[PDB]
Amino acid sequence: AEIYNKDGNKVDLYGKAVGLHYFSKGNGENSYGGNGDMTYARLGFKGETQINSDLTGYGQWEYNFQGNNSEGADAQTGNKTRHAFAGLKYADVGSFDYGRNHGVVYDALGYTDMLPEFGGDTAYSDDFFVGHVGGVATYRNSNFFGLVDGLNFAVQYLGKNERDTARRSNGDGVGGSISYEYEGFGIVGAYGAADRTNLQEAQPLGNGKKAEQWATGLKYDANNIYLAANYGETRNATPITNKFTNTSGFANKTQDVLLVAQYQFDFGLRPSIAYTKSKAKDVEGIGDVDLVNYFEVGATYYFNKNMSTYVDYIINQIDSDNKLGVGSDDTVAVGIVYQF
Amino acid sequence: AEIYNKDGNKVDLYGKAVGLHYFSKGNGENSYGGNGDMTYARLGFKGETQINSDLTGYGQWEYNFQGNNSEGADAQTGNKTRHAFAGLKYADVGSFDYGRNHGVVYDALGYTDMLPEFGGDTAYSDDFFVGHVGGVATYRNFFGLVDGLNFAVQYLGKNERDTARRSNGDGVGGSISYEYEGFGIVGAYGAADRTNLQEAQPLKKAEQWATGLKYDANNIYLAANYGETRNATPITNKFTNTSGFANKTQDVLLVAQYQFDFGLRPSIAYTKSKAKDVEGIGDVVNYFEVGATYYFNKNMSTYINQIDSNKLGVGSDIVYQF
Amino acid sequence: AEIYNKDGNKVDLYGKAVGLHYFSKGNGENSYGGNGDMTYARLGFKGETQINSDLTYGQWEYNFQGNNSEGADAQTGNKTRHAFGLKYADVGSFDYGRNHGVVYDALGYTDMLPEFGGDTAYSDDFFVGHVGGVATYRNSNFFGLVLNFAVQYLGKNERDTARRSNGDGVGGSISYFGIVGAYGAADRTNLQEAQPLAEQATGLKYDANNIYLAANYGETRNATPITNKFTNTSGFANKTQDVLLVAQYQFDFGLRPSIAYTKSKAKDVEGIGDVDLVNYFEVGATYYFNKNMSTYVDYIINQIDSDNKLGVGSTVAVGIVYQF
Ligand SMILES: [Zn+2]
Ligand SMILES: [Zn+2]
Ligand SMILES: [Zn+2]
């Protein structure tokens, strides 16, 4: 909701309130998602200022508040800052922001991250270039300095974050992305590589001096139709954690595909089908394991622009003999989301 | 504060800044509350959208920020998401919302939860149906026909918390009220399955109910509520270091408050809750209240334990808003 | 940003989004400030209502850190800065809650650097910074006679750690180029007295013709906390001698170059005796774009000895802050 425009500074304060619930077989411990309450609410601001006819300043922020938690010591469980950065867009030169932003490989992963509740499984938080990552400088360029229409590229730095845990750690990195949209159709191809922290390399699973992610995507966005498809492979990046022995680490090689097909009613109902598959290779002692693999049947009915409900049943494809203990039961979400 | 209204969507962003200090004998170890700083702040949003003339959508949220905490490692303590739900009201059919909302037994218990700071002692958080409870589906003047009487039905899904205090299972709850002639009646009850963790506590189904009768007119507030819980109320022991729920409790809440247009609102209240047939000690909070809250405008305002020295060790001895 | 005026009530909801990063040789083991990401965000409200003709506030401010991951460390740095009053005619103000310390009034004249500076202003350290639950009576323009004064009550705060604990105390400040002086003393906590290693400054400033010349001196008495890397033991400097010098000229162009020198030295601390806490030379060039978006560089020449008692480090910030 735009709540202030004066002396030429726009400030949008937005928020959600998703009443959410997962259903699986008796506390879905062996399922895709889980079981019970998932109610959460977000609260961020978008702020743009106009210094010149060409130069604008922005700063975005976004915090996650969890409603499933009690008022005990776990009241903060899941509370986190999703977005926090500030930047300058200048004429046709391009934009530049630093802070906690998306990774270049999310530009490519964005094409398919569109299911009502689930999807975008490959887009891990604090996993280098596929999602929210702390302290990252990002230069983006739209329409190649205004010359070519549709061709966009971006270039990302991503500085070192020596975390206490190896799960969220990262070192000096480099990332790129390229897109081309031509009347409905869309192609994209991102790639990024970074040094792995010594704590990450001292993990049981996964070996290699540096981490690497890339993915390429196609989409059709016209006539109230979305057909999204992307594929990507990580090498020494994806967290995997064996459920049996409770020993975590990174997958030496992954092969990930996302297919999304949804149609949009002007009536409001948006049915969605989706198939995802992320398969690990060269697992330190197991070999080829399926991280995630399923079919999706989703129907979101937007009431107005400020209110909706949705259902996301996920056909869990993972066989019971999963040599990593990853869930094999089915999950279905039921949500009523208000926003502003 | 209503901060946005456009294209059929009202959005209210509200907040408080209570500067509060507690006073008891010395450090108030065995007191009602505590002693020292108690400063805190609320900040939440309310948000209704008009889908139709009949169908309106809503969403609320509220989070607590404590001020008495230092800026160090303890800064997050007390910070909690109070309210968070999203629902639909439809013509005279009624409302339905899911998320962290108010329990049906609070509808009847809320008749007396109107003291300045204290009061509503039986309204325990994450305690089945008597307070702020996580993830709960809630349906709330009889199809528009009979005005002045409202009913509600609540579901409450299972919540497998680490601690026994906050856990629960599948349940059912009802509430029915009737208000007229500046007065109101209400009666709510609920029952639920307990987790095996809950069943395995020293001190497997929980029951809680209460009724309330009140009168508000001529700036006079006369509230009374009474009810009993069964295998619900947590209490634990300080001496024995043993936690658990009370087999049965006997709870009464008596409030009388008069609002003087001058601003001073004197409030006299008496509360009493006695646990029954507790496994170890048998039958064992109760006090009389003195309160004067001074309403300035629509924003600014400012504002006797009867428990013998007890086999349990129960204690003895300015708000801006927008 | 004022987001609501109706029925004579102003509700200003403000916020920032600072993209910060510290630079040091390889890692920040033996540096002043640190190294890596420092991105954070502020978000509070300033709420004033007029009750009558003469008598009229409620303020709050929370910290959200951005260098944290969405793992377990997400609330690392998250905290409330402010939460609390009335001003009546010429009587003056009075508020209770988590607010500033009276010794900050003198320290505030020099707490004016891009990112660093104001080292004497520790959080929850007697009266030199942000402290919880304090009644503060402040009077404006001396009842309209001339001069400004304030009195803080500072309630007891029985904290688990010795560093963040506090008891009852009293502090005063008076201000009127510009000069100011503040003093405060309080009963030390049980754990304050039971620690191996309290009373506490006056200020001068000149803010006119696009120049800011700031100078203040202060001495601590068993309140400034410190620990040493060698013996890993917490405590309090029995006495410190603190100086802050700030000299900056603000161009109409927008660029604001700043040079600053700070020095705080502890005295007869039970264990190390007289040691120098912090000492450096600062060169900063903050560039205000407009009244919202701005950036800054903050190079700091660390004047702490290598062979240093307590082993304090022997840095340069780069920020791009949007605000509202
Ligand atoms: Zn995002
Ligand atoms: Zn409530
Ligand atoms: Zn402050």
Author numbering:
A (entry chain A): 1 to 340
B (entry chain C): 1 to 140, 143 to 205, 209 to 289, 292 to 310, 315 to 320, 322 to 329, 336 to 340
C (entry chain B): 1 to 56, 58 to 85, 87 to 148, 151 to 180, 185 to 205, 211 to 213, 215 to 328, 331 to 340
Give the article text.
Herein, we design metalloglycosidases by constructing a hydrolytically active Zn-binding site within a barrel-shaped outer membrane protein OmpF. We supposed that a protein containing a void space, such as β-barrel outer membrane protein F (OmpF), would be suitable for our study; its overall shape resembles the structure of host compounds, such as cyclodextrin, which may provide a structural basis for various functions, including catalysis, by encompassing guest molecules and forming noncovalent interactions. We inspected the constriction zone of OmpF, the narrowest region, approximately halfway inside the barrel-shaped protein.
As a result, two triple mutants, R82H/Y102H/R132H (OmpF1) and L83H/Y102H/R132H (OmpF2), were designed as the parent templates. The fourth coordination site was possibly ligated by a water molecule, which is again suitable for our studies. In particular, D113 shows proper orientation and interatomic distance between the terminal oxygen atom and Zn-bound exchangeable ligands as 7.9–9.5 Å and 4.7–5.1 Å in OmpF1 and OmpF2, respectively. In addition, D113E mutation (denoted as /E) altered the glycosidase activities of OmpF variants; OmpF1/E and OmpF2/E showed substantially elevated activities, whereas that of OmpF1Y/E was somewhat reduced. For retaining β-glycosidases, such as OmpF2/E-R2, an acidic residue, possibly D113E, may initiate glycosylation as a nucleophile when Zn-OH2 species acts as a Lewis acid.
